[PDB]
Amino acid sequence: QVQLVETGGGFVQPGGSLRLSCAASGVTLDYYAIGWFRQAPGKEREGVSCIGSSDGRTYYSDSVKGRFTISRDNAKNTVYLQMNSLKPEDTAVYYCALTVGTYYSGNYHYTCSDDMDYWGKGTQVTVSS
Amino acid sequence: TNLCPFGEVFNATRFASVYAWNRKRISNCVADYSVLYNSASFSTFKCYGVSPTKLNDLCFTNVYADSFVIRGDEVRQIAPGQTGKIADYNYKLPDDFTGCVIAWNSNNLDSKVGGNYNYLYRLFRKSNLKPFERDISTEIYQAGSTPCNGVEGFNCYFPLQSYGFQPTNGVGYQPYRVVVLSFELLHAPATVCGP
Ligand SMILES: *[C@@H]1O[C@H](CO)[C@@H](O)[C@H](O)[C@H]1NC(C)=O
């Protein structure tokens, strides 16, 4: 009975600051990988970032530019993302999803792919001049 | 009779993963499949090419057993002559394949409260594999067009990932142990028959 909720929707002129919060409830997995996927009307689905819960390593694309800061509150089991330098092509609906981890030869690797097991109601972000 | 080794593959404490399934060969003994057929421990048993009561009469040269563990929904999906997500990367069935699979639920045998499991299977691959082919390489798959110089991360995604079974999971996520029996006939005298 895993439930995901996304909050932090806001509309403002480019160049501001934005914050997104993903909260998960009823999670029975000790370790998981939590990722953000954005989708906009008229364009396909692509992943931007996803982090592992074992220690906190992150995987991201080339569009991050270092402005995406992601923190994992273990006490509240929350994912908090803060960003600046608003980009017009980043306006979309964001969905946060967690997937099971991967164990191999005593090492932890996370598979963070398009196919997903669970989904949640993401938040819409639209920024324009 | 002749001490057929059917009590070493079907009912064992540990089974290998799906991507590297356990392969065993059976021959040089006479067996009675009537007892095995009339077993309630098997979730499903139905296939083509032979009748359950005709197994004893017909003589086969070799038997190949491929044992592994798959999900509940993957039991119905796997079948010869069809294309699927798991069938195109881990286990392919020939069109003229002789034999079939036997699946049984083992939720009590293999269950954990939480954590990652030792079973691995692949989500991405370069292309389809030939039928009855086993792959052992665990190299990264270059999903993106731009090369990453062989560094784990974006566009060089790791294909293998675990199951994460749970006792409270649905009927489709239950751990199902599957053994595939294939009858192979060659230019050799038959070695397996019935009483
Ligand atoms: C192992 O399982 C088989 C079912 O295929 C059963 O016939 C056999 O008696 C079992 N062995 C033991 C020792 O329980």
Identify the CATH number of the domain in which residue A93 sits. Answer: 2.60.40.10
CB contact at 8 A, B123 and A115: yes
Resolution of the experimental model, in Å, one decimal: 3.8
- In this complex, the residue of A31, A100, A111 whose CB is nearest that of residue B157 is A111
Residue with tokens 């999670």: A27
| Ligand 1 neighbours (beta carbon < 6 A) | B 10-11, 39, 41
Instruction: Measure the CA–CA gap between B133 and B83, rounded to whole angstroms.
Output: 16
Instruction: Measure the CA–CA gap between B7 and B103, rounded to whole angstroms.
Output: 16
Instruction: Measure the CA–CA gap between B71 and B175, rounded to whole angstroms.
Output: 5
The experimental technique behind this entry is cryo-EM
Instruction: Measure the CA–CA gap between A91 and A39, rounded to whole angstroms.
Output: 9
Domain span including residue A72: 3-125
CB contact at 8 A, A129 and A13: yes
Token digits of residue A38: 């954005």
Token digits of residue B32: 């009675």
Count of domains for chain A: 1
Q: Are A103 and B116 in contact (CB < 8 Å)?
A: yes
Instruction: Measure the CA–CA gap between B34 and B41, rounded to whole angstroms.
Output: 14
Half-sphere exposure of A129 (CA within 13 A, CB side): 3
Domain extent listing, chain B: 1-114+167-195, 115-166
Q: Which of B4, B11, B108 to mutate to test the pocket of ligand 1 (most atoms within 8 A of CB)?
A: B11
Instruction: Measure the CA–CA gap between B157 and A113, rounded to whole angstroms.
Output: 8
Tell how far the Cα of B72 is from the centroid of ligand 1, in angstroms: 22
Distance (Å) of CA A21 to CA A27, A75, B19, B30, B136: 17, 14, 37, 65, 41
Ligand 1 closest atom vs CA B7 = 1
Sign for the CA dihedral angle at B103, B110, A50, B90 comes to: negative
- In this complex, the residue of A28, A61, A102 whose CB is nearest that of residue B162 is A102
- DSSP characters for chain B? ----S-TTTSS-S----STT-EEEEE-SS---HHHHHS-TT-SB---SSS-GGGTTTS-BSEEEEEEEEE-HHHHHH--TT---TTTTTT----TT--EEEEEEE-TTTS--SSS--S-EEES--SS---TT-----------SSS--SS-SBTTB---EEE----TTS-GGGS-EEEEEEEEE--SS---B---
Tell how far the Cα of B119 is from the centroid of ligand 1, in angstroms: 24
Tell how far the Cα of A7 is from the centroid of ligand 1, in angstroms: 54
Token digits of residue B158: 């790791």
Half-sphere exposure of B28 (CA within 13 A, CB side): 1
Q: Which of B10, B37, B104, B181 to mutate to test the pocket of ligand 1 (most atoms within 8 A of CB)?
A: B10
Three-state SS for chain A is CCEEEEECCCCCCCCCCEEEEEEEECCCCCCEEEEEEEECCCCCEEEEEEEECCCCCEEECCCCCCCCEEEEECCCCEEEEEECCCCHHHCEEEEEEEEECEEECCEEECCCCCCCCCCCECEEECCCC
Q: Are A104 and B120 in contact (CB < 8 Å)?
A: yes
Q: How far is CA B147 from the centre of its chain?
A: 34
